[PDB]
A paper describes a structure:
Under these genetic constraints, cattle have developed a unique mechanism to accomplish antibody diversity by forming the broadest distribution of CDRH3 lengths and the most frequent occurrence of cysteine residues in CDRH3 loops. Consistent with the five structures solved previously, the 7 new CDRH3 structures also showed a long “stalk” formed by 2 anti-parallel β-strands supporting a compact, globular “knob”, further establishing the stalk-knob configuration as the general structural peculiarity for the ultralong bovine CDRH3s. Each of the knob structures starts with the conserved sequence motif [CP(D/E/A)G(Y/W)], in which the initial cysteine residue forms the first disulfide bond with another cysteine residue in the knob, and the motif forms a type I β turn. The compact globular folds of the knobs are maintained primarily by several disulfide bonds, a feature that is similar to the core of other small disulfide rich proteins or domains such as voltage-gated sodium channel antagonist mu-conopeptide, CnIIIC.
Residue numbers in the entry:
A (entry chain B): 2 to 9, 11 to 217
B (entry chain A): 1 to 186, 195 to 270
Write the structure that this text describes.
C-alpha cells in the first residue's frame, strides 16, 4: 500500500525538524529506508539510502534513523533551500518491488501562522438547469501553505469525484487552495447538507451548505 | 553523472496503451538498473517497475498485469508500456536509475523463538553478512553471537531521477468551457468548468479589476476535462458594485462574460 507520513511539518530557521515514516515488517521492518526531496520545477533528489547513509552531495544536516517499523528523517539546522516535499521509501518483500510514503510538505517559517478562510459555494442556478451541480470550496489566507480537505454529505465522508489543487501562493504571500465536488442535479437535491472541512495545522474550519434553504 | 530523458506522447486516449521511452547515457548506468516511477497530481510517488543490465524485469505486483518494460541496448533506451489506461493513469512519469541488491544478513526475526537471545536486531538489513539460510542452530539457554537467523535483506533506492514527463489520459476533444457564477448561499468567483486542453485566461471587468484577484490552477477531473476557479476579494466594505468575469479559451476561440451577484 503506502507508508504513512505527516502531511505537513514546519520549523524556524536553524531549528531541528523530524519527519516520521511508519510502515510494517515487510517494508520498513526490512531495515533499508530511503528519503527523497522534491522541489517544484526540479527533478527529485535522493537524500538518504540504507536507513542512515547519505547520498553524494547531501549536506550533513540531513540524517536518517529507524526503530522497528518506523523510520525518521531529521534536519538538524534548517535553511531556506530545505523547503520542499519529502518522501520515504523501502523495498516490499523483494529487491524489485518498492513502496513510497505519503509525503510531507516542509515549510521554513517566514511569517506568522494564519488560519484558512473557507467559503463553500453552491452550484449556480445556470448549472442546475443543465442537470449538473459542482460544489466549489475556495480556501485562502492560510500559512503555512498546506491543508487537507474532507468533503461530507449529511455527516458522511465522500471521496468520489473530488479534486483538490495544491496550495498556491497569493499576492499577499499567503497561500490558497481549491477543492471540487462534482454531482448531478439529483444528488444535490437528494441530500440535506453538504460540508467542506479544511484542516490546517491540526485545526479544522468547516463550511456547510443546505440544498433546501440555499436558494 | 548519468543523464535520463523521457520521450513519448503527452496525451493518450483511454483504453489505449501508454508507451514511453527513456534515453540513458553515462558510464555509471551499467552498474545499476533503470526503472519507472510515476506520481499523479497531489498524490504519492508510485513504483512501476525496473529492468537491469541483463534484461530481467520486475514490476509492482498491483500493476504487473498492465506493465511491460523492455530495453534497447544499442540506442541505450528503456521503454515502458501501460495497457488499457484510464483517467487515473494521468501522472508525471519519471525515468530513474535504481540500486537493487538482495543479500543475506544476520538478524533476529520477531516470531522466532530465539530472538530474545540474538544480538543482530529485528531488521533484516543488519549489515552483518552470513551464508546459508534460516536459523543458525547455535542458540542455547543464554544469549550468544552464534544465535542468529540468516535472512534476506532487500536493498533498494533510486540513484538518479529524470525530470519527468506529464501524461494526460482523456478521450475528450478540445471543448469550450462553461462559466458559472460563484455566490454564497445566505468573496465571489467564477467557475470555469469542463474545458480542454488548457489554458484559459480570466480577467474581471475587462481588466478594470485585477488586484485582489486570485485565479487557481486547474484540476483534471474524472470526466477527462479541466476546471479552474477565479476568486475576487472585495475591500473597503464597499457594497453595490456589479462584478463580471471574462473567460477566454484559445482552443475553442471563445470569449464569455458572466455577471456575479447575490
Amino acid at each position: 500500500a503506502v507508508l504513512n507520513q505527516p502531511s505537513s511539518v514546519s520549523g524556524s530557521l536553524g531549528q531541528r525538524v523530524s519527519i516520521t515514516c511508519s510502515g510494517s515488517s515487510s517494508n520498513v521492518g526490512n531495515g533499508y529506508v530511503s528519503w527523497y526531496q522534491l522541489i517544484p520545477g526540479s527533478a527529485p533528489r535522493t537524500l538518504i539510502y540504507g536507513d542512515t547513509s547519505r547520498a553524494s552531495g547531501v549536506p550533513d544536516r540531513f540524517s536518517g534513523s529507524r526503530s522497528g517499523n518506523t523510520a525518521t528523517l531529521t534536519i538538524s539546522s534548517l535553511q531556506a533551500e530545505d523547503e520542499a516535499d519529502y518522501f520515504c521509501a523501502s523495498a516490499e518483500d523483494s529487491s524489485s518491488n518498492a513502496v513510497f510514503g505519503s509525503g510531507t510538505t516542509l515549510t521554513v517559517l517566514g511569517q506568522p501562522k494564519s488560519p484558512p478562510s473557507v467559503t463553500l459555494f453552491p452550484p449556480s442556478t445556470e448549472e442546475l438547469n443543465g442537470n449538473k451541480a459542482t460544489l466549489v470550496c475556495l480556501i485562502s489566507d492560510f500559512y503555512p501553505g498546506s491543508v487537507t480537505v474532507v468533503w461530507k454529505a449529511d455527516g458522511s465522508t465522500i471521496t468520489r469525484n473530488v479534486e483538490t489543487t495544491r496550495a498556491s501562493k497569493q499576492s499577499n504571500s499567503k497561500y490558497a487552495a481549491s477543492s471540487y465536488l462534482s454531482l448531478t442535479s439529483s444528488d444535490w437535491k437528494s441530500k440535506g447538507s453538504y460540508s467542506c472541512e479544511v484542516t490546517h495545522e491540526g485545526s479544522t474550519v468547516t463550511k456547510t451548505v443546505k440544498p433546501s434553504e440555499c436558494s | 553523472q548519468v543523464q535520463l530523458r523521457e520521450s513519448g506522447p503527452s496525451l493518450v486516449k483511454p483504453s489505449q496503451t501508454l508507451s514511453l521511452t527513456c534515453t540513458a547515457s553515462g558510464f555509471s548506468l551499467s552498474d545499476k538498473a533503470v526503472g519507472w516511477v510515476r506520481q499523479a497530481p497531489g498524490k504519492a510517488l508510485e513504483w512501476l517497475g525496473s529492468i537491469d543490465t541483463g534484461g530481467n524485469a520486475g514490476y509492482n505486483p498491483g500493476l504487473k498485469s498492465r506493465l511491460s518494460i523492455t530495453q534497447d541496448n544499442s540506442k541505450s533506451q528503456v521503454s515502458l508500456s501501460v495497457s488499457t489506461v484510464t483517467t487515473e493513469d494521468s501522472a508525471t512519469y519519471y525515468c530513474t536509475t535504481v540500486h537493487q541488491k538482495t543479500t543475506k544478513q544476520k538478524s533476529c526475526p520477531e516470531g522466532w523463538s530465539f530472538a530474545d537471545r540474538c544480538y543482530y536486531g529485528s531488521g533484516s538489513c543488519s549489515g552483518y553478512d552470513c551464508y546459508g539460510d534460516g536459523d543458525s542452530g547455535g542458540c542455547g539457554a543464554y544469549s550468544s553471537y552464534h544465535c542468529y537467523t540468516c535472512t534476506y535483506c532487500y536493498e533498494w533506492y533510486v540513484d538518479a531521477w529524470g525530470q519527468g514527463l506529464l501524461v494526460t489520459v482523456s478521450s475528450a476533444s478540445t471543448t469550450a468551457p462553461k462559466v458559472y457564477p460563484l455566490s454564497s448561499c445566505c468573496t465571489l468567483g467564477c467557475l470555469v468548468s469542463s474545458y480542454m486542453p488548457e489554458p484559459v485566461t480570466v480577467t474581471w471587468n475587462s481588466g478594470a479589476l485585477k488586484s485582489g484577484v486570485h485565479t487557481f490552477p486547474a484540476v483534471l477531473q474524472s470526466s477527462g476535462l479541466y476546471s479552474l476557479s477565479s476568486m475576487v476579494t472585495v475591500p473597503g466594505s464597499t457594497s453595490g458594485q456589479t462584478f463580471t468575469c471574462n473567460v477566454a479559451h484559445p482552443a475553442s476561440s471563445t470569449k464569455v462574460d458572466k455577471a456575479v451577484e447575490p
